[PDB]
A paper describes a structure:
In plants, guanosine deaminase (GSDA) catalyzes the deamination of guanosine for nitrogen recycling and re-utilization. The zinc ions are tightly bound to the active site, coordinated by the completely conserved residues His80, Cys113, Cys110, and the key water molecule. AtGSDA catalysis needs two key sub-processes: the activation of water and re-capping of the active site, which proceed via the two critical residues Glu82 and Tyr185, respectively.
Furthermore, the Y185F-Gua structure indicated that only one Gua molecule was bound in a substrate-bound conformation but the ligand could be clearly distinguished from the non-reactive state, judged from the rotation angle of the purine ring. It should be noted that these cocrystal structures showed averaged results of multiple deamination reactions, as either the substrate or product could be present in individual enzyme molecules. Lastly, the “out” conformer was also observed in the cocrystal structure of the partially active mutant Y185F, and there was only one ligand in the dimeric enzyme. Y185F had difficulties in binding to the substrate, as shown by other single mutants (Y185E/K, etc.) or truncated forms of the enzyme, while retaining the correct fold (as suggested by TSA). The Y185F conformations were reminiscent of the apo-enzyme, where it had one disordered C-terminus in one monomer while that of the other formed loops and pointed out. We found that while WT and Y185F/E showed similar binding affinities toward the ligands, the Y185K and E82Q mutants showed differentially reduced affinities.
Numbering used by the authors:
A (entry chain D): 29 to 184
B (entry chain A): 29 to 185
């Protein structure tokens, strides 16, 4: 179940990087096993540096459910959310976060050294009440191999 | 220069709460004393909780300049940017943030305790690089007054 939606997010990351919409990142917002939004990074397509997978997914889910809170929903992120996207997940009142890969896997292929203190519990001012699960096992392995596969696809 | 655009961000906050767009928060993005974007909170207008004033100004400025980085621009925020908007400011690579009122002013009237460590200098993983100026004197008084003036004329979020 967690595996299913995290896998869908990984596939979204691959789809988005293939169509040039943005980086290899995907997010899926679900409401009691019903998928509300299935998105990926749209930074290049939208010319929007805020259009990460999770922000895009939140925007879609909110417009679709006609409310600015997603407290009955859960978000699946193929990669550990950034400071911006974790702030967005907090503001959206999403009740649970499941992320597949560590930020270090994206930093390994050259992404910003940009990690959210509130997610890792290393803040003085910003804390978090949100349920956070780092995926393990098969889903985590699949999620982490995304960045090396993407770097290989564009090496030459 | 600073006071002008800070006052414009505050005016955007007032205009946004009056027309019910969202909360008393404004943002103004400038490129060498030329406004490229002037925005306020649109969370209620757009049904988008990410549509704070700063994120809205970033989206609009990036559409106006046709690029995803604003390295040659500065941003003026009526209130201290939250973690989400400060992360957005980092991703946008704005070279300078000037902000009006400390976040405690917004919290006192009913908003969440939701403060950016990397802005206040207490970040471990998120380390900013941009110049950050907190307003003093008249700009500080104006931005602080925003929250008493608009105490309950808007829908909390
Ligand atoms: N800086 C800023 N804070 C906002 C905005 N909208 C709501 N807030 C809240 O204001 C408080 C102080 O940043 C936090 O609880 C935020 O969630 C906005 O548009 N800009
Ligand atoms: Zn992000
Ligand atoms: Zn904000």
């Amino acid at each position: 179940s967690d595996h299913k939606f995290l896998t869908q997010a990984v596939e979204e990351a691959y789809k988005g990087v293939d169509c040039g919409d943005g980086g290899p990142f995907g997010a899926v917002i679900v409401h009691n096993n019903e998928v509300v939004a299935s998105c990926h990074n749209m930074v290049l397509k939208y010319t929007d540096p805020t259009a990460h997978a999770e922000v895009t997914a939140i925007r879609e889910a909110c417009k679709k459910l006609n409310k600015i809170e997603l407290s009955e929903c859960e978000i699946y992120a193929s990669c550990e959310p950034c400071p911006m996207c974790f702030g967005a997940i907090h503001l959206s009142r999403l009740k649970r976060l499941v992320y597949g890969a560590k930020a270090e896997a994206a930093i390994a292929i050259g992404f910003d050294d940009f990690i959210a203190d509130a997610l890792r519990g290393t803040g003085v001012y910003q804390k978090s009440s949100l349920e956070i699960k780092k995926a393990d096992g098969n889903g985590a392995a699949i999620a982490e191999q995304v960045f090396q596969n993407t770097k290989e696809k564009f090496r030459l």
